[PDB]
Amino acid sequence: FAYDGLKRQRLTQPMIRNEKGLLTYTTWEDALSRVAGMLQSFQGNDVAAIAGGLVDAEALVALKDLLNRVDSDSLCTEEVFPTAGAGTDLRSNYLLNTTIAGVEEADVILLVGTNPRFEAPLFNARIRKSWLHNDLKVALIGSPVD
Amino acid sequence: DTRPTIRPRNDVVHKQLSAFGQYVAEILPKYVQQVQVSCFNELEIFIHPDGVIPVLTFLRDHTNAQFKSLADLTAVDVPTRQNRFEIVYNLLSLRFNSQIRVKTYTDELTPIESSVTVYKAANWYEREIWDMFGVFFANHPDLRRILTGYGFEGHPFRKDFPLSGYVELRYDDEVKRVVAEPVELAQEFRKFDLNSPWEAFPAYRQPPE
Amino acid sequence: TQDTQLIAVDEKLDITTLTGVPEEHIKTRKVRIFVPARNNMQSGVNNTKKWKMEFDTRERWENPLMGWSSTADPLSNLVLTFSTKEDAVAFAEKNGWSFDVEERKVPKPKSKSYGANFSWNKRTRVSTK
Amino acid sequence: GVRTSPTGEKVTHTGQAYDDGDYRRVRFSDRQKEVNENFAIDLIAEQPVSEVGSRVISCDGGGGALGHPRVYINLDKETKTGTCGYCGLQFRQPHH
Amino acid sequence: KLGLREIRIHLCQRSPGSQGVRDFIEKRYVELKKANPDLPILIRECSDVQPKLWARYAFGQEKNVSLNNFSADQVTRTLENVLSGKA
Amino acid sequence: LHHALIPHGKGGRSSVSGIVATVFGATGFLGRYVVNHLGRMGSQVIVPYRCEPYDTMHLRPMGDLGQIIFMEWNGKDKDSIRKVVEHSNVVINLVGREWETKNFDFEDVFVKIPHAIAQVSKEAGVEKLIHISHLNADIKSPSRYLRSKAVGEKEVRAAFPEATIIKPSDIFGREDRFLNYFASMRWFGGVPLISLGKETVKQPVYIVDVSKGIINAIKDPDAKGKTFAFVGPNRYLLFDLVQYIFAVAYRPFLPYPLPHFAYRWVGRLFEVSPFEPWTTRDKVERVHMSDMTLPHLPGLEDLGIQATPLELKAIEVLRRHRTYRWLTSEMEDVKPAKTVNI
Amino acid sequence: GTSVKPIFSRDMNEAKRRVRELYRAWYREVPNTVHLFQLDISVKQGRDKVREMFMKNAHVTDPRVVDLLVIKGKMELEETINVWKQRTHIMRFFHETEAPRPTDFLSKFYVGHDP
Amino acid sequence: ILPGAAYTEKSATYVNTEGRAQQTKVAVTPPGLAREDWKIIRALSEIAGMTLPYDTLDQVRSRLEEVSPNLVRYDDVEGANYFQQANELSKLVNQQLLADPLVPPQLTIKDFYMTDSISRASQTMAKCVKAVTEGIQAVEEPSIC
Numbered sequence A: 001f002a003y004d005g006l007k008r009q010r011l012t013q014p015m016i017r018n019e020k021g022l023l024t025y026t027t028w029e030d031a032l033s034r035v036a037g038m039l040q041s042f043q044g045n046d047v048a049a050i051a052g053g054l055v056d057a058e059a060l061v062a063l064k065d066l067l068n069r070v071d072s073d074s075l076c077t078e079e080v081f082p083t084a085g086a087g088t089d090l091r092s093n094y095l096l097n098t099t100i101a102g103v104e105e106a107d108v109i110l111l112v113g114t115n116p117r118f119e120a121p122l123f124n125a126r127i128r129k130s131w132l133h134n135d136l137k138v139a140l141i142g143s144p145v146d
Numbered sequence B: 001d002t003r004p005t006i007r008p009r010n011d012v013v014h015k016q017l018s019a020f021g022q023y024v025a026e027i028l029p030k031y032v033q034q035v036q037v038s039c040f041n042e043l044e045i046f047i048h049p050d051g052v053i054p055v056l057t058f059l060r061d062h063t064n065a066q067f068k069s070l071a072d073l074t075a076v077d078v079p080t081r082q083n084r085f086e087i088v089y090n091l092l093s094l095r096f097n098s099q100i101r102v103k104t105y106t107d108e109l110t111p112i113e114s115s116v117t118v119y120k121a122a123n124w125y126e127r128e129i130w131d132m133f134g135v136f137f138a139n140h141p142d143l144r145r146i147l148t149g150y151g152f153e154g155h156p157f158r159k160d161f162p163l164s165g166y167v168e169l170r171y172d173d174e175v176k177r178v179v180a181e182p183v184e185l186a187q188e189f190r191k192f193d194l195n196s197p198w199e200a201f202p203a204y205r206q207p208p209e
Numbered sequence C: 001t002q003d004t005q006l007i008a009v010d011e012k013l014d015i016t017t018l019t020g021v022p023e024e025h026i027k028t029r030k031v032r033i034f035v036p037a038r039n040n041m042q043s044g045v046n047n048t049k050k051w052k053m054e055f056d057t058r059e060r061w062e063n064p065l066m067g068w069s070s071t072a073d074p075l076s077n078l079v080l081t082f083s084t085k086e087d088a089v090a091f092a093e094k095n096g097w098s099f100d101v102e103e104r105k106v107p108k109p110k111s112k113s114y115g116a117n118f119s120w121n122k123r124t125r126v127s128t129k
Numbered sequence D: 001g002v003r004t005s006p007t008g009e010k011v012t013h014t015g016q017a018y019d020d021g022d023y024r025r026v027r028f029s030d031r032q033k034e035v036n037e038n039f040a041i042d043l044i045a046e047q048p049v050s051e052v053g054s055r056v057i058s059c060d061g062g063g064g065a066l067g068h069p070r071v072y073i074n075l076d077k078e079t080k081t082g083t084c085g086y087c088g089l090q091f092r093q094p095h096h
Numbered sequence E: 001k002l003g004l005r006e007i008r009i010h011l012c013q014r015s016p017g018s019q020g021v022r023d024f025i026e027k028r029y030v031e032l033k034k035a036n037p038d039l040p041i042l043i044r045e046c047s048d049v050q051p052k053l054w055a056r057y058a059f060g061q062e063k064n065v066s067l068n069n070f071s072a073d074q075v076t077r078t079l080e081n082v083l084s085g086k087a
Numbered sequence F: 001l002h003h004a005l006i007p008h009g010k011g012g013r014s015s016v017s018g019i020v021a022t023v024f025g026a027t028g029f030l031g032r033y034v035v036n037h038l039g040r041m042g043s044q045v046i047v048p049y050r051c052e053p054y055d056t057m058h059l060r061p062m063g064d065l066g067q068i069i070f071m072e073w074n075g076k077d078k079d080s081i082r083k084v085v086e087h088s089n090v091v092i093n094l095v096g097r098e099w100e101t102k103n104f105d106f107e108d109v110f111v112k113i114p115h116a117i118a119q120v121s122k123e124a125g126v127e128k129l130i131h132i133s134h135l136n137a138d139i140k141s142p143s144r145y146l147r148s149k150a151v152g153e154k155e156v157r158a159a160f161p162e163a164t165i166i167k168p169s170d171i172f173g174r175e176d177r178f179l180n181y182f183a184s185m186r187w188f189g190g191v192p193l194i195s196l197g198k199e200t201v202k203q204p205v206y207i208v209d210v211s212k213g214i215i216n217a218i219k220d221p222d223a224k225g226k227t228f229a230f231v232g233p234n235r236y237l238l239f240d241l242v243q244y245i246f247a248v249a250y251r252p253f254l255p256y257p258l259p260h261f262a263y264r265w266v267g268r269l270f271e272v273s274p275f276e277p278w279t280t281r282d283k284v285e286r287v288h289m290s291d292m293t294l295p296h297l298p299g300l301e302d303l304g305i306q307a308t309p310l311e312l313k314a315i316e317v318l319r320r321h322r323t324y325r326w327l328t329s330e331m332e333d334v335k336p337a338k339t340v341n342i
Numbered sequence G: 001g002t003s004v005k006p007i008f009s010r011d012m013n014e015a016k017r018r019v020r021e022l023y024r025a026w027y028r029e030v031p032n033t034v035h036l037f038q039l040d041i042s043v044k045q046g047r048d049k050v051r052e053m054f055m056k057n058a059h060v061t062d063p064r065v066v067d068l069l070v071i072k073g074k075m076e077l078e079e080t081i082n083v084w085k086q087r088t089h090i091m092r093f094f095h096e097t098e099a100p101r102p103t104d105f106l107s108k109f110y111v112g113h114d115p
Numbered sequence H: 001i002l003p004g005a006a007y008t009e010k011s012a013t014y015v016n017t018e019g020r021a022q023q024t025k026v027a028v029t030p031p032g033l034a035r036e037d038w039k040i041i042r043a044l045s046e047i048a049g050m051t052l053p054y055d056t057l058d059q060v061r062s063r064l065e066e067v068s069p070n071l072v073r074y075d076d077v078e079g080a081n082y083f084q085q086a087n088e089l090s091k092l093v094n095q096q097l098l099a100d101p102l103v104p105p106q107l108t109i110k111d112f113y114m115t116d117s118i119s120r121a122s123q124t125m126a127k128c129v130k131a132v133t134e135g136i137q138a139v140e141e142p143s144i145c
């Protein structure tokens, strides 16, 4: 029940700031020219991009290449993951390695500081499914939740 | 009657048609691939595409067949098959008041010998199969578009062809002419997905593969 | 087989010039070979036994007069059916259409047992009927 | 009831009225915006709620074959009146 | 300045052609990261991938280097010139 | 842009373009052609008219159903213009008349009516107004047509500062009263050029070029306030132009020098007619003015449209005038009239 | 399997021969269309269009395909000869009323959401 | 405020938490003048001069393969390895745990609904948070029809 979210408060036409700083509708050409000029003038580490949460993968690589060509390696993300040590270098450091389907095989699960019921409802459903038949034992390290 | 709604079934006609199917199969084993009689007493002979001229001629000239009227000649396009085009001949014998079906197969770029020599009625029919589907019939007196407009690009009855086509017509005053433009419908054809997800007929249940 | 000086035409079959499809609608489109998923509203699988080929959805605007779903994509409501994946991809390559075939998902065979509803040691024992 | 939008366009029962800054209103000048004054939303409101003396009641819309398919409404909740889903007529138990 | 912006090692999991690369990433990697604890050395692996090395330089420049059938010492050597060839 | 003016579709008939426009005087020459282009891209046209609705029938089949809307309007009635331009992005002014009717002089249809159109369009809130004048527009030209056009241009510029002003030189087309005029001059004996027509230089522009220029100027975001001049690619000597016109028509050519005052008398005699005045004093004058070259003014090529030479699109105009004898001769049979270099 | 029936020609060279003679017929014809059909395009302006139509499907290499378009072009020539096509039918080859379409990515992005 | 395209209005690659990279297909076109995100970035790069190489969706997918070959193996879990190396690199910082308890940001149904932009802009999730927050009196309606 979130498809209605894609019917309200949408951005349809490009907006630019006018002489009062008020957002006004403009053609794609004007806004793209403004952004292109600002990218051309300011270069180096003064250029940055904070990728969102619902973005795709194609746009991420496009933005990464665009900001790399202006020598900007300040591509950040809203979420914070510990970059100390291996960080993103090793994939298994930031992956649910044994897959969602593997939950139905494990015998002991230790969830640390998580509420999978809301953070990942299908993952919690899989944990419950394994809990029913396989008699898997759960242990929580975070705050008590339902 | 015990079956006031079920259509009556005739078995004598079934036996006669099966006997004639075996007769035709024995007469021309070179081309007759498979013969079958439907439940509603219609006999179909599936032949190799090379047997178009011979088999028809036999069915037209044999004393025991005497099929001297090409009722209908058509094609059915099944994209999932290798040779998608499936040419169908419907013949009627006025002496034995019986209808027969001779069905052959052919892909997009394989020619079929024109049956105009045997059935002179086929001359127009063949053109239609050429125009609607694209099956080229060699040794034809004149192959041309028969239904589509002049300069049409494509074969409309092919499954891989939109029912609205690609080009619509209009009158342009700038050129004072009936010009052709890319198709653009005011209301798109609403494609209805009406198909029950529950198996209808247990008899025609394809075995799993 | 066919004794008419039967010629080797090894190079792959292509009727892109024999279909009448315009320039635009033959490479910028992307067909999709897939087995349709069962409608989760229902519980019948008779619609998940034939492969289907379809074309990417394009612009669908509103008619200014009445508000219809006007479109300019002829290959929008055209969906082909195929008995097997290989035949569907053969059709896609034959007509020169870019594809991306998805494998056929199959429901994994479960293990049902009425007795488990009334188990004595396990947690599958139901609390209601 | 049909009422007038600030531009001057009458709103239909579906709440449809072209915006002031909408060019489509050009179609209505020298013509009229065809609307139906008899609003079904209002017309069904003043129909009296029948005091049915049974737990459930069958409604066919009146006229048998002339009406809608016959449906049975359960009049058990005292806080609401059972309303037929086809014609909108209400029913109520006699004070339970 | 081409200050060795990023390294991307794309090795296959199972094929023997990437075997040497595996040995490298098995042993000669922890000390590599200890040497320069700023380099985004990427070890994004995939099935059926010829072992390759991408060296993204500054201003968006890349030079792919094949690592097919290389040894652990071979991969080590073919990488040391890359991170030592920049000032 | 409004929620319904966002461009949609692929430029076909049933595509939302966002060029909701009013074309005053659409029932005639370019007024038709412009609408066609406006109809082709899918723009809602609010074509006003004063003539019989039957004469607007050819206006009907160039727009998708619901796009083209016809309204009654009167030149001397501000309320009518306000009704027609109330909901429109652009207002194109194509009102004109080669003669002076009893109830409408040149000033009325080139100053008064454009003044009302521009003032009402500015009051309503339209964003573009494309006004059309003549290239040879001068406040001191003997013909009242060009003088009235000049004062009308000044007034329109004053009322609508950002109004695009387009000054076509001479439109030739299937119904042009410029090539058909010379072709029809065969009935009255020979063709009576003033001073043999060896001093007038004319630069004719194709009708399709002008209409496409109007459309591009509407689409161009920089045409506001500018004053374009739409001219053909070549400059023809008037005698050579008539030579080409009669060669493509294959009618006999009988040039005849004629004193200016006698031709003025002929123009008055033709003006007497209570119907379509075949020739007027203004008409015989204008065919004798040269096309004033204005290099400073921006041209069609700036809008992105290449002028089509008269030779390629002369067979369309004059194929009707040919008798049965040369009715099928090709376009390359007659060699292009020599042109004085620009 | 790899070897299948031929349509008319038994090699690419014979298919090119048929293409050559079809182009012969079209090139000889063109001015007759210009005059008879009362066309307004120049003679060369039709001959180059014949050339462009031939060059469009110049990438095909399956012989049977080449014979197929040889027959189709022969049919179009047949229609053009005995005034079976009309002025509008012939003029469709020169897409006149169609607005020019853009080729660069930037204009397509500016104009709509299409490939 | 260059308007982008949504997940229902684009064919794009998303990777779940297990590493599997799936792709969403276009169902509706972007509203108004909005366009695809990658197309917007590529057009901006062209305008600014530093034009990106990829000009089609397949080209962008090829570039994605160039950066990471496991972003194109659709519906294929590419198992990662080398946990020992990551652990060895991890045992160098010696960062000290704090005393604040590990409290998840969402601990009730009320926090589940309105999380992202689409959910926040939606109205049914507003009715849901209303239903869960105050009580049962906010969900009365004529459901007889």
Ligand SMILES: NC(=O)C1=CN([C@@H]2O[C@H](COP(=O)(O)OP(=O)(O)OC[C@H]3O[C@@H](n4cnc5c(N)ncnc54)[C@H](OP(=O)(O)O)[C@@H]3O)[C@@H](O)[C@H]2O)C=CC1
Residues within 6 Å of the ligand: F024, F025, F026, F027, F028, F029, F030, F031, F050, F051, F074, F075, F093, F094, F095, F096, F097, F098, F104, F109, F132, F133, F134, F135, F167, F168, F169, F170, F171, F172, F176, F178
């Ligand atoms: N070579 C040329 O002809 C050139 C012309 N122009 C200008 O282009 C414009 C259009 O030219 P063209 O289309 O050839 O002209 P036409 O005479 O063919 O058409 C003129 C249009 O103006 C309308 N009109 C004229 N007077 C009035 C009036 N008093 N009230 C209402 N409507 C009126 C006419 O209505 P109706 O049809 O009912 O009479 C018609 O729609 C004119 O301004 C003209 O001066 C500019 C450069 C060159």
Ligand SMILES: [Zn+2]
Residues within 6 Å of the ligand: D059, D060, D061, D068, D084, D085, D086, D087, D088, D089
């Ligand atoms: Zn009822």
